[PDB]
Design a protein around this nucleic acid. Structure first.
Ligand code: MG
Ligand code: MG
Ligand code: MG
Ligand code: MG
Lengths: 134, 149, 77
RNA sequence: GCCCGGAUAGCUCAGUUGGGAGAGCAGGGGAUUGAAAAUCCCCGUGUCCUUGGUUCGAUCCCGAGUCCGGGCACCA
RNA sequence: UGAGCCUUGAUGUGUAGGAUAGGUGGGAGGCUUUGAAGUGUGGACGCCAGUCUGCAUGGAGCCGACCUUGAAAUACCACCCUUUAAUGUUUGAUGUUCUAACGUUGACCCGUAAUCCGGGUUGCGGACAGUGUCUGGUGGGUAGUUUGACUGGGGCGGUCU
RNA sequence: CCAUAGGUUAAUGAGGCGAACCGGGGGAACUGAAACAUCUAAGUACCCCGAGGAAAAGAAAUCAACCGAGAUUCCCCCAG
């Protein structure tokens, strides 16, 4: 069951509380623990009720830092999971990488979407815990 | 309400605490019998200036109550006589009043607030164990006898 | 008479505005309640017919100040 | 105007947070009996209110509409 | 005791498919001597095919690339879903005990030559009852009013643009 | 127990009447709306309490508008 690798991961990440990007991307920099290069992943339990048909979103985004053109489509649970490059990329550039993702996410806000558009955004690597972004 | 404890309260704390107590609890119980005082700055400074002599009187009162418990435990010569019927049936009842009268005739003018009894009131002839609460921590036990005179 | 002994709150008169704005005279009465207060400075229990506001006023000022104001303005308790 | 419920075989109603359309009663035929009834066996149902969408598939999961109801709201 | 929320578990059986295919996205490396394939042992669920869990020894072995599929492996990671269990946390329903608010049109004492009242002792009840503010329902008990015109009289019928 | 309640005495003051005016506590309806309920009558009539030669109010937590005024009360405009 639980192993030393997993208990040190949960010792490194205290996901019960929220974090800001400035130090949370440094938390991802220090969570990079694998023999092979990992890819940064971001999941938002976004507020659109894709269970409503008309609230579905299809979009695209070209990223300056590369991975550089990525696509995304909302699932039934209403959660966006996207990867926007490798883990060895610098924290600063990854910040504006997810910021470009975020603005491309806001530009497609459906008029039927009622409530908080972005319930929460979390970032996690291949073998890392989810750190909230503020 | 913010109130300042004057005594060891069961759940609030010890002598001297700014505790947020309900208005009814403070007004109707804590304040009337000296156990707490409102958190007025005048009272707060007046209490913090003279605080050290309060635990002195508290300690001597506690010691006196502990001594009283041993005294009433050692007395243990309590008899109440009442005209009762056969089969060990008491016509009336022996209450805290009669208990206090007997312990007044035995020891020193023991009141009827400290005396405690179980749900029953010993409506039958026999020897019963009577509980006494001289203080909040004091538990005293007394042996009594009843005569069917 | 329904008069708060601390604040002097008396029953006032107003209207009962209906949905059609019909107005009928009505009376607002103070939330008066007889209460026994432990006056420590004389070791007594003073009974006052006081409203809830007046009881809260006694709470803030202290019973001694309220009784001082009373016996200053008459109105023996 | 708001909220909720209901529409499924001739009738009455189940049906699952989607993987095949049910069950009684009715009907028909057969069996039993001298005959009938009651029991027994077999048979055959459906725009699943409609329409669009989701889905690999919809009675279901929505969007929209029809009708039936229940409660509330309603000072050109 | 419900219910919300957090955290850990279990949780997923139509068809080919190896067989109890949850959804999405990332993704063959990861599990492992600090006990792997196994071997006897108690159960949970169950579609009776099986999955998960405790204990005993083991001292490095194990997972996949493929047949299929709407959907891929079920190696793993993150979010979440249906259900259920546990901890923690939050509000909510009762139920029980207590006395100190409050009630007392129970008893006794006193003011007092007093079936009022007030104070005291005490019993019972007790955070109930009752009252104040606000609020849904009911409310000819009470109050203010309306209940058209034309018309071979009025009413009835008819009519009114 | 103390005390307090209560009692007695002494001193001081008040009671009641009165026209209008004034402050306050309550407060209609007829009527108008060509009916009537919001509204009007109207805070009027009336009841009650309180005073004085007057009463009330009164020295800005007021106005104004970037210039300024400077307590309260009353009259004429503003202005139907
Ligand atoms: Mg009538
Ligand atoms: Mg009239
Ligand atoms: Mg006519
Ligand atoms: Mg009129």
């Amino acid at each position: 069951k639980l192993t030393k690798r997993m208990r040190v991961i949960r010792e490194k990440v205290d996901a019960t509380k929220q974090y800001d990007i400035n130090e949370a991307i440094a938390l991802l920099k220090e969570l990079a623990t694998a023999k092979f290069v990992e890819s940064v992943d971001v999941a938002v339990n976004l507020g659109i009720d894709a269970r409503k048909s008309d609230q579905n979103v299809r979009g695209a985004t070209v990223l300056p830092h590369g991975t550089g053109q990525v696509r995304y489509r909302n699932d039934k649970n209403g959660i966006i999971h996207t990867t926007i490059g490798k883990v060895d990329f610098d924290a600063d550039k990854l910040k504006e990488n997810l910021e470009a993702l975020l603005v491309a996410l806001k530009k497609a806000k459906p008029t039927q979407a009622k409530g908080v558009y972005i319930k929460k955004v979390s970032i996690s690597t291949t073998m890392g815990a989810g750190v909230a972004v503020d | 309400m913010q109130v300042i404890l004057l005594d060891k309260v069961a759940n609030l704390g010890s002598l001297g605490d700014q505790v947020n107590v309900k208005a009814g609890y403070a007004r109707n119980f804590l304040v009337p019998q000296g156990k707490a005082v409102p958190a007025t700055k005048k009272n707060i400074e007046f209490f913090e200036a003279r605080r050290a002599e309060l635990e002195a009187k508290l300690a001597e009162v506690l010691a006196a109550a502990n001594a009283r418990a041993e005294k009433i435990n050692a007395l243990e010569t309590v008899t109440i006589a009442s005209k009762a019927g056969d089969e060990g049936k008491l016509f009336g009842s022996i209450g805290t009043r009669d208990i206090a009268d007997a312990v007044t005739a035995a020891g020193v003018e023991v009141a009827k607030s400290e005396v405690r009894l179980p749900n029953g009131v010993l409506r039958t002839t026999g020897e019963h164990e009577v509980s006494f609460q001289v203080h909040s921590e004091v538990f005293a036990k007394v042996i009594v006898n009843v005569v069917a005179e | 008479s329904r008069v708060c002994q601390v604040t002097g709150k008396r029953p006032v008169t107003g209207n009962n505005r209906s949905h059609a704005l019909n107005a009928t005279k009505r009376r607002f009465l103070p939330n008066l309640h007889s209460h026994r207060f432990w006056v420590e400075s004389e070791k007594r229990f003073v009974t006052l017919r006081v409203s809830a506001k007046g009881m809260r006023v006694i709470d803030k000022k202290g019973i001694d100040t309220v009784l001082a104001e009373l016996r200053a303005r008459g109105e023996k308790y």
